[PDB]
Swiss-Prot record:
Protein name: Lysozyme C
Origin species: Gallus gallus
GO cellular component: cytoplasm; endoplasmic reticulum; extracellular space
Cystine connections: C6-C127, C30-C115, C64-C80, C76-C94
Keywords: Allergen, Antimicrobial, Bacteriolytic enzyme, Disulfide bond, Glycosidase, Hydrolase, Secreted, Signal
Compartments in which it is found: Secreted
Misc. remarks from the entry: Lysozyme C is capable of both hydrolysis and transglycosylation; it also shows a slight esterase activity. It acts rapidly on both peptide-substituted and unsubstituted peptidoglycan, and slowly on chitin oligosaccharides.
Length: 129
């Protein structure tokens, strides 16, 4: 499913991401924009052999099981394919474990390089929330 900017903002809000760990809603929407272009079906393989999945490009090396990442840890206790659904629930739950983990949203390279320290509020501008 390719989400709309405001549609995604609303679902993430409903799922408790706003201000989660102190990150405002626009941070989450900005990251989704640059990680996957708002496409829940996005996949990208990495050089280490792991793969990133979904709107927030959660990595198979730590977070989910894809059956082809040797040494994967599966910290979110879920099949990576679950992160590709039109229902963002699994994505959101797993992302909450990631961001609590220590380096905050820096976990997401595109957030760090493209969102951090920018006016992220522009991302939820005009939405009915």
């Amino acid at each position: 499913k390719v989400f709309g900017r405001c549609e995604l903002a609303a679902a993430m809000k409903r799922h408790g991401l706003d201000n989660y760990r102190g990150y405002s809603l626009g941070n989450w929407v900005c990251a989704a924009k640059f990680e996957s272009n708002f496409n829940s079906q996005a996949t990208n393989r990495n050089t280490d052999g792991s793969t990133d999945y979904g709107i927030l490009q959660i990595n198979s090396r730590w977070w989910c099981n894809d059956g082809r990442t040797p040494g994967s840890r599966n910290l979110c206790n879920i099949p990576c394919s679950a992160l590709l659904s039109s229902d963002i629930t699994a994505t959101v739950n797993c992302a909450k474990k990631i961001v609590s983990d220590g380096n905050g949203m820096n976990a997401w390279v595109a957030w760090r390089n493209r969102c951090k320290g920018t006016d992220v509020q522009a991302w939820i501008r005009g939405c009915r929330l």
